[PDB]
């Protein structure tokens, strides 16, 4: 599969493009709502970019559940496995 | 016009009798219980009497004018709405009882599940008829307030005395208990068909609904009231002679 | 114990007074005034509004000719 | 003519507002109103046929608004009852929720609709034929509504729209999959 | 995966809801058409319930093929594997 580091790097690049938050800020223990201050629409944009680049489909209902970067990484790894 | 009003006032008692007979027959067919039918009839009589009483009382003191159409509509609408509310309440209560809950919990489940729906239905009926108050013809306009007040009275009676009657009677023996325990295979089938294949069913339903538009091109109306009266009224006799 | 809501509890606890009050009020209303048929007979409303041009024309003819002031007529046939 | 237009517009707007307030959804209210309007057209067609072509007496000039003002409200009420039950049963999945709601309400709503229709149609025994025409038109309308619009059209539309039926509320189409039970 | 017992228990609960047949009656050697007397519409209802609860999708063409409870259990296990 893909190591957690690779998924974090890809998601950090996408988040940098969407919001402008530097990649060094994105760590797996950060909360999107509070730590990174990312609203739901930005999250669906991240999902669209992820689906169109790495072919990982994340429905909106799951996007509601995801809270921290680690949660998204775990979800992606679960799908990959 | 005078004969039209006279016949409208004359046929009201017969209309009321026939409606009560038909309602009793259908309630007997549905509930299979004489006592349940008597309870529903008592509720309907209370609601109808309240509606006609308040309308007559307000009309007598010149609060608003009246027509024969207004009175007939008031009576029939009151009867129908009262029966519908009784059916809704008792149906939910019996469903809760058949599920397994005891009578107290069944009553509370019935109220929790149908209280808002009955109120909303009554408010829709009251507000719809009240829109007739904004018309220009007096025949339509004089129906708005009376119908609205009657519907409000019927709804208040159904939402307050209805639950009270249900609470009192159910305690005194096996009165409102479901008479025939049976599920609904037909409704299971209809629900499954509607869920699995919605496109085909929707297509068929929409096709069926649009069939009625074929009558529109040939529609026309007439204004001669002697065609809408029995031949024995004095006006029709004079018309024949002339 | 389940927290029963106030409204259904009130309806259940005081059911008999509520039923009696409703029956009494309905009987009083149906007794004080006449039946709906008589009230409807004595409170009938004109079919045509006063804005109707035809009604205004008939009343205008009546007042100009100084004969009548209504707008309704009947025919006697021999 | 003008009164019919006014009555239709005002009744539709008021019913839409009430349904939107009660169901907390816009699309559901729109669906209810549209289905009721379609049933109204079918009712008009059936009544015109039955009277004008079969009996031979055309409809009176004042039948239409009186029939419409009641058909709209009662059809909306029945659809509202079904949708309100659906909203309570929906936590188990949209499709299973719809099936359970139909099984729960069907018999009750059918009995109530039949009672209302046969009460309205019983006005046909009046000496005045205008009242009979009004009653039969409303009765046919409620019959068609109960047997078609509520039973088939409304749940079909609800299934097709899916999560958009409850907009702007957020509703899962299907719940989180569960592990098989251990006996 | 899931043991045959778990699948049988879940299907028995669903069948109890749909038709009313008690769970004790549902055994893997029972035939839907004859032993349990379940028509095709009841079977598609069972399929809908199964898809909405456990996420197992059974198309109608397969529903035609399935004959006994054991057949359905085998189909579900094959999908799971
Ligand atoms: C769009 C979003 C994911 C935003 O969620 P947020 O309120 O958590 O930012 C959420 O509102 C949602 O799922 N809405 C349902 C569909 C929708 O809003 N479509 C856009 C309206 S045109
Ligand atoms: C519905 C069903 C599964 C029932 O099968 P049965 O006759 O074995 O009970 C079968 O008739 C079928 O596949 N029909 C094709 C699609 C269909 O019937 N749709 C409903 C008609 S509106």
Residue by residue, DSSP assigns D153-183 as: IHHHHHHHHGGGGGTTS---SS----PPPP-
C-alpha torsion sign, points B41, B46, B47, B52: positive
CB contact, 8 Å: D178 with chain E?
A: yes
Chain D residues within 8 A of E28 when measuring between CB atoms: none
Q: CA-CA distance, A24 to B173, in Å (whole number)? A: 75
Resolution for this model in angstroms, one decimal place? 2.8
Q: Radius of gyration of chain A from Cα atoms? A: 11
Q: Radius of gyration of chain D from Cα atoms? A: 19
Tokens of B43: 């509720």
Q: Are D123 and D135 in contact (CB under 8 A)?
A: yes
Range of the domain at A21: 2-81
Residue in C12, C30, C37 closest to B12 by CB: C37
**Distances from the Cα of E43 to the Cαs of A68, D48, D99, E52, E54, in angstroms?**
42, 43, 14, 14, 16
Q: Which residues are bridge partners to D33 per DSSP?
A: none
CB contact, 8 Å: E18 with chain B?
A: yes
* Residue E41 alpha carbon to ligand 2 centre in Å: 7
Contacts (Cβ under 8 Å, ≥6 apart) of B221: D58, D59, D60, D61
Q: Are A36 and A30 in contact (CB under 8 A)?
A: yes
Residue B11 backbone dihedrals phi, psi, to 5 degrees: -80, 0
Question: Would you call E62 a catalytic residue per the annotation?
Answer: no
Q: Are D175 and E53 in contact (CB under 8 A)?
A: yes
The residue from E35, E39, E60, E71 that is catalytic is E39
Which residue, among C13, C14, C17, C26, would best test binding to B if mutated, counting the most B CBs under 10 Å from its CB? Answer: C26
The full length of chain D comes to 183
| Residue whose CA lies nearest to ligand 2 atom number 18 | B193
The helix (run of H) or strand (run of E) holding residue D31 is: helix D26-48
| Total structural domains within chain A | 1
The residue from A34, A35, A37, A39 that is catalytic is A39
Instruction: Report residues whose beta carbon is within 6 angstroms of any ligand 2 atom.
Output: B 193, 197, 200-201; E 39-41, 44, 60
Q: Are B202 and D160 in contact (CB under 8 A)?
A: yes
CB contact, 8 Å: D95 with chain E?
A: yes
Q: CA-CA distance, B3 to A45, in Å (whole number)? A: 74
From the CA of B193, give the closest atom in ligand 2.
20
Residue A31 backbone dihedrals phi, psi, to 5 degrees: -90, 130
CB contact, 8 Å: D5 with chain B?
A: no
Q: Are D120 and B80 in contact (CB under 8 A)?
A: yes
Q: Which residues are bridge partners to E31 per DSSP?
A: E68
Chains B, C: CB contacts within 8 A come to 117
Q: CA-CA distance, D22 to D88, in Å (whole number)? A: 13
The three-state secondary structure class of B222 is strand
Q: Which residues are bridge partners to C44 per DSSP?
A: B66
Q: Which ligand is nearest to the CA of B190?
A: 2
**Distances from the Cα of D182 to the Cαs of A80, D45, D141, E6, E23, in angstroms?**
28, 57, 51, 5, 14
| Residue whose CA lies nearest to ligand 1 atom number 17 | D168
* Residue A44 alpha carbon to ligand 1 centre in Å: 9
Q: CA-CA distance, D115 to D121, in Å (whole number)? A: 10
Q: Radius of gyration of chain C from Cα atoms? A: 27
Which residue, among B76, B183, B200, would best test binding to D if mutated, counting the most D CBs under 10 Å from its CB? Answer: B76
Residue E6 backbone dihedrals phi, psi, to 5 degrees: -65, -45
Q: CA-CA distance, B129 to B135, in Å (whole number)? A: 11
Contacts (Cβ under 8 Å, ≥6 apart) of D93: D172, D173, D174, D175, E52, E53
From the number of C-beta atoms within 10 Å of its C-beta (0-12, 13-18, 19+), residue B76 rates as buried
**Distances from the Cα of D152 to the Cαs of A25, B206, E60, in angstroms?**
54, 10, 21
Q: Do B71 and C40 touch (CB under 8 A)?
A: yes
| Residue whose CA lies nearest to ligand 2 atom number 4 | E40
Residue recorded with tokens 């009553």: B107
Q: Which ligand is nearest to the CA of D169?
A: 1
CB atoms inside a 10 Å sphere around CB C66: 7
Q: Which residues are bridge partners to D60 per DSSP?
A: B222
Widest Cα–Cα separation across chain A: 31
Return the ∠ at Cα B167 (arms to B163 and B169), rounded to 5°. Answer: 115
Nearest to C2 by CA among B122, B179, B112: B112
Q: Radius of gyration of chain B from Cα atoms? A: 22
C-alpha neighbours within 13 Å on the C-beta side of residue D158: 34
Q: Do D180 and E52 touch (CB under 8 A)?
A: no
Contacts (Cβ under 8 Å, ≥6 apart) of C75: B238, B242
Chains touching D (3+ CB pairs < 8 Å): A, B, E
- Mind giving me the DSSP string for C25-54? HHHHHHHHS--HHHHHHHTB--SS-TT-HH
């Amino acid at each position: 599969a893909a190591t957690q580091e690779e998924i974090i790097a890809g998601l950090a690049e996408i988040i940098e493009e969407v919001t402008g938050i530097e990649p060094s800020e994105v760590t797996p223990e950060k909360s999107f709502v509070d730590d990174l201050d990312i609203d739901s629409l930005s999250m669906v944009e991240i999902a669209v970019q992820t689906e169109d680049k790495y072919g990982v489909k994340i429905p909106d209902e799951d996007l509601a559940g995801l809270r921290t970067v680690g949660d998204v990484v775990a979800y992606i790894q679960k799908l990959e496995e | 016009s005078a004969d039209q009003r006279a016949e409208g006032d004359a046929s009201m008692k017969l209309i009321e009798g026939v409606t009560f007979a038909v309602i009793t027959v259908m309630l007997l067919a549905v509930y299979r219980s004489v006592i349940t039918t008597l309870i529903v009839l008592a509720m309907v009589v209370l609601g109808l009497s309240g509606a006609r009483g308040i309308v007559a009382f307000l009309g007598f003191y010149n609060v608003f004018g009246l027509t024969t159409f207004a009175t007939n509509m008031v009576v029939t609408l009151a009867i129908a709405a009262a029966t519908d509310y009784a059916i809704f309440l008792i149906g939910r209560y019996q469903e809760a009882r058949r599920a397994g809950e005891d009578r107290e919990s069944a009553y509370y489940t019935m109220f929790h599940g149908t209280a808002h729906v009955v109120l909303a239905s009554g408010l829709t009926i009251a507000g719809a008829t009240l829109c007739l108050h904004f018309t220009r013809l007096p025949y339509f306009q004089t129906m708005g307030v009376p119908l609205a007040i009657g519907m409000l009275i019927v709804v208040a009676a159904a939402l307050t005395a209805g639950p009270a009657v249900i609470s009192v009677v159910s305690r005194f023996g096996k009165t409102l208990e479901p008479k025939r325990f049976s599920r609904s295979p037909g409704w299971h089938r209809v629900g499954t068909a509607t869920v699995r294949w919605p496109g085909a069913i929707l297509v068929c339903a929409v096709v069926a609904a649009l069939i009625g538009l074929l009558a529109l091109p040939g529609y026309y109306t007439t204004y001669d009231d002697r065609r809408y009266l029995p031949d024995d009224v004095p006006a029709n006799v004079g018309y024949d002679a002339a | 114990a389940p927290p029963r809501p106030r409204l259904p509890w009130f309806l259940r606890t005081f059911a008999v007074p509520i039923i009696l009050a409703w029956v009494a009020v309905v009987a009083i209303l149906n007794t004080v005034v006449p039946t709906l048929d008589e009230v409807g007979e004595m409170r009938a409303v004109s079919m045509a509004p006063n804005d109707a041009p035809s009604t205004l024309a008939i009343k205008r003819v009546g007042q100009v000719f100084e004969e009548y002031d209504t707008s309704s007529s009947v025919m006697i046939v021999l | 003519d003008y009164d019919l237009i006014i009555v239709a517009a005002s009744a539709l707007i008021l019913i839409f507002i009430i349904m939107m307030v009660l169901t907390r959804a816009v699309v559901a209210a729109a669906v209810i109103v549209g289905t009721v309007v379609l049933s109204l057209a079918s009712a008009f067609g059936l009544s015109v046929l039955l009277w004008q072509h079969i009996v031979g007496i055309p409809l009176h000039w004042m039948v239409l608004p009186m029939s419409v003002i009641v058909l709209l409200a009662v059809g909306a009420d029945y659809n509202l009852l079904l949708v309100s039950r659906m909203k309570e049963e929906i936590h188990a999945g949209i499709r299973t929720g719809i099936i359970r709601a139909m099984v729960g309400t069907g018999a009750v709503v059918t009995a109530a609709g039949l009672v209302f229709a046969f009460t309205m149609a019983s006005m046909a025994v009046s000496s005045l034929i205008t009242i009979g025409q009004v009653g039969t038109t409303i009765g046919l309308g409620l019959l068609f509504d109960t047997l078609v619009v509520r039973s088939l059209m409304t749940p079909s539309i609800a299934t097709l729209l899916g999560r958009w039926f409850w907009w702007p509320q957020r509703v899962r189409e299907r719940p989180v999959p569960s592990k098989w039970p251990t006996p």
